[PDB]
Amino acid sequence: HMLELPHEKDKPVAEPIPICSFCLGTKEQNREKKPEELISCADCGNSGHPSCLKFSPELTVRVKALRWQCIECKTCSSCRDQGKNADNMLFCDSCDRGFHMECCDPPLTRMPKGMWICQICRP
């Protein structure tokens, strides 16, 4: 029972690039030369092995069910921008959506220290 955002719906999906941006191999060979299906950006088509993206199996499953943005394409799920502090945009460890600290509810001013999950994923 994973929640999808209205603005993530009915949007164009770029043609997936069948190669990992990190290890430069296909779904048939990850870094260990083992099979691993790719995760692909719906904006630009950029793909990566979950292993290359350092995704946990749990995060991998949830991301595959969502409209995912690659590391470069990721916009704030609140304000829909990258902005001045795009490098500091938080990534949810549950769904990998992006959130500026000031766009979080409630707002943050300092970086959380361990695992962080967004307002959408928080119980």
């Binding site: 990190f22 430069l24 993206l53 690659c70 590391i71 500091n88 970086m111």
Partner: peptide, 15 residues
Amino acid sequence: ARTKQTARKSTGGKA
């Protein structure tokens, strides 16, 4: 932490 900047560092850059 885990931000966009750290994601770049952690995975080794994109191509």
